[PDB]
Structure formats: C-alpha cells, structure tokens
Enzyme design. Structure first.
Site, PDB file in Angstrom:
ATOM      1  N   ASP A  20       0.823  -1.208   0.000  1.00 43.39           N
ATOM      2  CA  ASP A  20       0.000   0.000   0.000  1.00 43.39           C
ATOM      3  C   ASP A  20       0.869   1.276   0.000  1.00 43.39           C
ATOM      4  O   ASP A  20       1.709   1.447   0.883  1.00 43.39           O
ATOM      5  CB  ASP A  20      -0.930  -0.059   1.224  1.00 43.39           C
ATOM      6  CG  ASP A  20      -2.165   0.796   1.073  1.00 43.39           C
ATOM      7  OD1 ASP A  20      -2.050   1.899   0.515  1.00 43.39           O
ATOM      8  OD2 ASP A  20      -3.247   0.377   1.549  1.00 43.39           O
ATOM      9  N   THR A  60      -6.852   3.689  -2.487  1.00 41.50           N
ATOM     10  CA  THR A  60      -6.704   2.285  -2.128  1.00 41.50           C
ATOM     11  C   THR A  60      -7.737   1.382  -2.788  1.00 41.50           C
ATOM     12  O   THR A  60      -7.396   0.326  -3.333  1.00 41.50           O
ATOM     13  CB  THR A  60      -6.820   2.150  -0.621  1.00 41.50           C
ATOM     14  OG1 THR A  60      -5.655   2.695  -0.047  1.00 41.50           O
ATOM     15  CG2 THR A  60      -6.873   0.674  -0.219  1.00 41.50           C
ATOM     16  N   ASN A  81     -12.472   5.605  -2.517  1.00 43.71           N
ATOM     17  CA  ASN A  81     -12.670   4.986  -1.206  1.00 43.71           C
ATOM     18  C   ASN A  81     -14.072   5.274  -0.672  1.00 43.71           C
ATOM     19  O   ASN A  81     -14.659   4.473   0.064  1.00 43.71           O
ATOM     20  CB  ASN A  81     -11.635   5.493  -0.204  1.00 43.71           C
ATOM     21  CG  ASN A  81     -10.246   4.942  -0.459  1.00 43.71           C
ATOM     22  OD1 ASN A  81     -10.065   3.945  -1.157  1.00 43.71           O
ATOM     23  ND2 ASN A  81      -9.260   5.580   0.132  1.00 43.71           N
ATOM     24  N   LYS A 142      -5.894  -3.903   5.667  1.00 39.10           N
ATOM     25  CA  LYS A 142      -7.108  -3.098   5.499  1.00 39.10           C
ATOM     26  C   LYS A 142      -8.204  -3.967   4.901  1.00 39.10           C
ATOM     27  O   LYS A 142      -7.935  -4.765   3.997  1.00 39.10           O
ATOM     28  CB  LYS A 142      -6.878  -1.884   4.575  1.00 39.10           C
ATOM     29  CG  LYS A 142      -5.901  -0.807   5.064  1.00 39.10           C
ATOM     30  CD  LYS A 142      -5.884   0.366   4.060  1.00 39.10           C
ATOM     31  CE  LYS A 142      -4.868   1.430   4.443  1.00 39.10           C
ATOM     32  NZ  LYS A 142      -4.741   2.517   3.424  1.00 39.10           N
ATOM     33  N   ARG A 144     -10.645  -3.132   2.885  1.00 37.94           N
ATOM     34  CA  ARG A 144     -10.873  -2.861   1.468  1.00 37.94           C
ATOM     35  C   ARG A 144      -9.800  -3.493   0.566  1.00 37.94           C
ATOM     36  O   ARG A 144     -10.096  -3.845  -0.581  1.00 37.94           O
ATOM     37  CB  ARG A 144     -10.973  -1.352   1.204  1.00 37.94           C
ATOM     38  CG  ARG A 144      -9.866  -0.488   1.814  1.00 37.94           C
ATOM     39  CD  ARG A 144     -10.169   1.003   1.588  1.00 37.94           C
ATOM     40  NE  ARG A 144      -9.200   1.893   2.234  1.00 37.94           N
ATOM     41  CZ  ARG A 144      -9.324   2.387   3.465  1.00 37.94           C
ATOM     42  NH1 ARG A 144     -10.378   2.079   4.213  1.00 37.94           N
ATOM     43  NH2 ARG A 144      -8.394   3.195   3.953  1.00 37.94           N
ATOM     44  N   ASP A 271       1.624   2.581   3.689  1.00 41.61           N
ATOM     45  CA  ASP A 271       0.640   3.639   3.496  1.00 41.61           C
ATOM     46  C   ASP A 271       0.389   4.445   4.775  1.00 41.61           C
ATOM     47  O   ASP A 271       0.398   5.680   4.745  1.00 41.61           O
ATOM     48  CB  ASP A 271      -0.666   3.042   2.983  1.00 41.61           C
ATOM     49  CG  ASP A 271      -1.710   4.107   2.633  1.00 41.61           C
ATOM     50  OD1 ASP A 271      -1.542   4.801   1.610  1.00 41.61           O
ATOM     51  OD2 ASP A 271      -2.703   4.232   3.383  1.00 41.61           O
ATOM     52  N   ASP A 316      -1.128  -0.311  -4.797  1.00 42.42           N
ATOM     53  CA  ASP A 316      -2.482   0.166  -5.121  1.00 42.42           C
ATOM     54  C   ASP A 316      -2.456   1.605  -5.658  1.00 42.42           C
ATOM     55  O   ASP A 316      -3.427   2.067  -6.272  1.00 42.42           O
ATOM     56  CB  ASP A 316      -3.439   0.057  -3.896  1.00 42.42           C
ATOM     57  CG  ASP A 316      -2.967   0.848  -2.664  1.00 42.42           C
ATOM     58  OD1 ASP A 316      -1.759   1.164  -2.601  1.00 42.42           O
ATOM     59  OD2 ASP A 316      -3.796   1.140  -1.737  1.00 42.42           O
ATOM     60  N   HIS A 317      -1.335   2.289  -5.454  1.00 43.76           N
ATOM     61  CA  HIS A 317      -1.137   3.662  -5.938  1.00 43.76           C
ATOM     62  C   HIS A 317       0.222   4.124  -5.455  1.00 43.76           C
ATOM     63  O   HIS A 317       0.852   3.462  -4.628  1.00 43.76           O
ATOM     64  CB  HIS A 317      -2.213   4.609  -5.399  1.00 43.76           C
ATOM     65  CG  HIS A 317      -2.391   4.487  -3.920  1.00 43.76           C
ATOM     66  ND1 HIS A 317      -1.462   4.973  -3.023  1.00 43.76           N
ATOM     67  CD2 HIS A 317      -3.346   3.877  -3.180  1.00 43.76           C
ATOM     68  CE1 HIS A 317      -1.853   4.689  -1.793  1.00 43.76           C
ATOM     69  NE2 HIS A 317      -2.992   4.022  -1.860  1.00 43.76           N
TER      70      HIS A 317
HETATM   71 ZN   LIG Z   1      -3.623   2.652  -0.503  1.00 38.92          ZN
HETATM   72 ZN   LIG Z   2      -3.372   5.950   1.701  1.00 37.26          ZN
END
Ligand SMILES: [Zn+2]
Ligand SMILES: [Zn+2]
Ligand SMILES: [Ca+2]
Length: 503
Positions: A20, A60, A81, A142, A144, A271, A316-317
């Site tokens: 993340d 995310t 999100n 997380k 998600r 993250d 994820d980014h």
């Molecule tokens: Zn993320």
């Molecule tokens: Zn973040």
C-alpha cells in the site's frame, strides 16, 4: 538458481502482493539497498519499474480493484474509497467503497464489510469458476484491500480489525488457524518495541520537519506495550500479515494440490507510515528496509516448503512527500490546498456534496473552481462520458483520459475537480493528523512498480509504461486460464525474456 522459464509449466501457487502506497518513486529510491525479498524480485524477476494505476482516482479501493481483475475502475465500479449515492435509502448518502449500505443502521462511519460494490470477478473468482477445487485466500491490513483482491467467491478473507487482531465478514467464525495467528498477534502487541536503529541508508534522512503542531522525519517506531495505533502505523503489522499469509499457505497446503491456488496479500504499513510521516524520512526508510527483510523471510519459507509459486508484487497507488520537507529539498513551490476548497467551505461558497477538496462533486462551480490558482481543471460528467475508454501508453495519457479510467456513470460525480501538481490535498491546520497523501492524477500517485518472479526465470527490465490491469491476463497466461479480452481492460504482458512468449 537453475534456469527455468517462468512459463515452462503452470505454477501451483499464485502469490499476489499489494504494498500500500509503495510508489515507484519510493521503490526506485531505495532499490540499491535491497538485500532480501525485494532484491530477489528486482535482480531475478520481470521488472516493470514504470507500472501505472492508470486512472485518476489514485486511492486504495480503486487501486486494489484493478490488481486482480484486469479491470479499470471504470469497469470495476470502485471509483474512490468513498462516493455519494444521493438516492440511498439510509440517512448517510456517503458510501464506503467496501460496504453493503443496505444493512440496517449502517453508515459510512459504521458499516458492514462486503464485496457487493465490485462489479467484475477477480482472478481467484475466475480460477474457481473454471475449477471449484481452487482455494482463494486474501489477507491484508485493510478490509478494502483484502476484499477487492479476493472477490465475492473467495474462500478466506481476513483483515486487521483492531486490537482484537484479524477478522472477516459478519458471521465468519475464527478458524483454528486464525485464533492461532491472533494469539501470536496479541503476544506481539503486548510487547514493547524499543524502536529500530537506522539502516545506513536511513541515516541521511534523520532530521526533523515541522508541519503544524507536529514534527516528523526522525521516528523509529518506538512504542509502548498495548499501543495498537503505534503497532498499526509501523512495520510490525506487515510482519504479522506476512506471518499470517505463510501460516495460511502451509495450513491449507496451498500449491500442494493438483490445481493452482491463489493468495493475495495486502501489506498496509507503507501507506499508514507515508500518511503519518511523509515519505522521505527515517520512518518510511525503516519501513521499506523492514519490508525487504520480511519479504525475504517469507519467500525463504515458501522455498523451504518446496512450493512452486509465482509472485507478482505491485502497489495500489503511489505517494507524495509532505510539502514542508519538499520545500527543504529543492521544491519550494510545494504547498497545501486552500482550506476554501474543502467540502464545507466550498459548498458554502458555491448545493453540493464532496468528500474532499478534489475528485467527485455531486449536485444536491466551474467559474469559481477554474479561477482558483491551485486548480488544474474541472471536468463535467458529460465531458468525461464523452471520452472513449483510453488505450495507448499510460505514461502519456491526458488528464481526461485518466478521469475516464475511473469514471462509472451511476456512481461518479457531476464534476471532477483536479488540483495542480505539487498541491497537497491536506490543508494547513494548527492541529494536523496526516501530513501527506496520494489521490491526485499526477505521476507520483499513478506510477507503481510491477514485479513478477518465479524460481529460475530469466530476468529482464521493461521501462515503458504498463498498467496494473495488465496483471490478471499476464498471470492467467501462465496457468492457461482463458480470459476473454472483451471482459477486461488490460493486456497480457509477456513475462518470458527474448524470443519465446508466455502470452
Ligand atoms: Zn492505498
Ligand atoms: Zn493511503
Ligand atoms: Ca518474449
């Protein structure tokens, strides 16, 4: 190791790791110091240092929704999100990306986790559909992350739920495996951490930076016993998630049966650390080094188990450092977004609903926003809808092409607000929490590594842009799983260096 093509035979286990906020910038910066698991991937693997979470909404949920679906958020329906559904039955029209908002008494602040919103199958879902003996496991820091990588037909979906440890959907009882993992977790949480000494490469990063009431840059993750927040925002949670993944792999004998199994692993610490401290201090530096070490230990464990696995690792980014330190390090133009653009203030100025000072805005504007010095541009819904689904090199997409890639007519806003580069979407406040974030349409936030590895393969480096939606068909090729090109957005990446082609 003995030479063997990544596509010689189907791998028995697919291991998908999402780190993340592990931006290509951060990955690239510390690449020369990897000695463990990340060294294995970069020196031996198929290395795409310029991968793209190609859409505009670099968060995310949209990001994880691409990794094992081959689908952009325009197709997964996971556009952020959080997004608004002003026609929702319940009072709170703000919806969480990974909830079932139809559940009574629910709100975005108190929700029931669900894959309901995800519109397409995952790689695990596709494997299970072709062969029901397939096990599909997804664990993460997380909910998600776990949910969107696993999909609705996953066998096991677990995420860090708080000081109680890992949990799953409502009604899902802890298994012997999980109680054992949560026992280990509780023991670790109950121990103090005196902190990590600095790796040689982190020494240069050891100086304090003020941002409002806070000071960052020198943290070493010292924490008291029982400090769950400290545990969460530290390398410790990643070590635990990897231990969990390893225990699950062994306990369920993943990769040791006739069919190929798959486990997805969402490592969340990078993250939290990036948000809380920014990305260039001792904190991120320690975390990336621990990440390298722990992945090494993880791969060694699977190796010793004799498991024939293929790994994909990505993010994820991307991410972006806090403006206060950028201004110290030759980027004086870095700044925080005007407080006037945040949801309450902007509505009062303009009648609208918004979740932050950028992204989707919903009518219960153009003139005021376009005149604002920190605003790059604002798209209307119609403009985005009028844009064809982008193709071609993601590193040179236009902003509206990026917007189109995370556009979903029934969920997206009536306007899309995009800030100028080097505007951080966290306004200055006397008291601040997070100092840095991602979520912008700019390259720091889109660009992520994509690394593929299997024992004995031929290393190569491919520096041109690819998309994370390319991951599913790339992997599917290895296990000879048919994926109709019209059902996904991504393309197969050849993972075999030179003349032969895994695609
Ligand atoms: Zn993320
Ligand atoms: Zn973040
Ligand atoms: Ca080839």
């Amino acid at each position: 190791p003995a030479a063997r093509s990544i596509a010689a035979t189907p791998p028995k286990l697919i291991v998908a790791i999402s780190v993340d906020q592990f931006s290509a910038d951060l990955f690239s910066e510390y690449r020369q110091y990897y000695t463990g698991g990340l060294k294995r991937l970069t020196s031996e693997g198929a290395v795409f240092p310029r991968g793209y979470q190609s859409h505009a909404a670099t968060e995310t949920c949209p990001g994880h929704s691409t990794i094992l679906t081959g689908s952009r958020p325009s197709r997964t329906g996971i556009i952020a999100n959080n997004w608004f559904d002003l026609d929702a039955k319940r009072e709170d029209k703000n919806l969480y990306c990974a909830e079932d908002e139809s559940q009574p008494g629910s709100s975005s602040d108190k929700y029931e986790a669900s894959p309901l919103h995800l519109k397409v199958p995952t790689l695990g879902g596709r494997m299970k559909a072709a062969n029901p003996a397939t096990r599909v496991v997804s664990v993460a820091g997380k909910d998600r992350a776990a949910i969107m990588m696993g999909g609705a037909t996953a066998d096991q979906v677990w995420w860090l739920g708080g000081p109680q440890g890992y949990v799953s959907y409502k009604g899902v009882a802890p298994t012997p495996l999980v109680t054992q993992v949560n026992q280990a977790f509780a023991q670790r949480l109950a121990q103090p951490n005196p902190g990590f000494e600095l790796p040689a490469q982190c020494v240069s990063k050891d100086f304090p930076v003020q941002a409002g009431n806070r000071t960052v840059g020198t943290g070493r993750f010292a924490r008291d016993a029982g400090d769950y927040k400290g545990f969460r925002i530290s390398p410790e949670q990643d070590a635990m998630t990897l231990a969990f993944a390893a225990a699950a792999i062994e306990n369920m004998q993943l990769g040791k049966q006739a069919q190929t199994d798959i486990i997805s692993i969402g490592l969340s610490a990078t993250d939290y650390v990036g948000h809380t401290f920014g990305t260039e201090g001792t904190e991120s530096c320690i975390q990336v080094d621990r990440l390298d070490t722990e992945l090494g230990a993880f791969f060694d464990k699977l190796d010793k188990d004799g498991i024939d696995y293929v790994v994909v690792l990505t993010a994820d980014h991307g991410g972006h450092d806090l403006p206060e330190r950028h201004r110290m390090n030759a980027m004086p133009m870095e700044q925080r977004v005007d407080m006037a653009l945040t949801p309450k203030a902007l509505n009062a100025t303009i009648v609208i609903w918004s979740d932050g000072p950028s992204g989707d805005i919903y009518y219960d504007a153009l003139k005021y926003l376009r005149a604002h010095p920190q605003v790059q541009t604002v798209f209307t819904k119609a403009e985005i809808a009028a844009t064809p689904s982008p193709s071609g090199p993601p590193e040179s997409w236009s902003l509206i092409q990026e917007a189109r890639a995370s556009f979903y007519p029934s969920r997206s806003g009536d306007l899309l607000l995009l800030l100028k580069p080097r505007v951080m979407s966290i306004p200055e406040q006397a008291v601040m929490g997070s100092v840095a974030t991602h979520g912008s349409p700019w390259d720091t936030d889109r660009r992520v590594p994509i690394l593929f590895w299997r024992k004995g393969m031929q290393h190569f480096e491919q520096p041109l842009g690819v998309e994370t939606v390319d991951i599913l068909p790339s992997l599917a090729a290895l296990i000879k799983l048919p994926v109709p090109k019209d059902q996904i957005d991504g393309r197969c990446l050849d993972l075999v260096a030179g003349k032969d082609d895994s695609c």
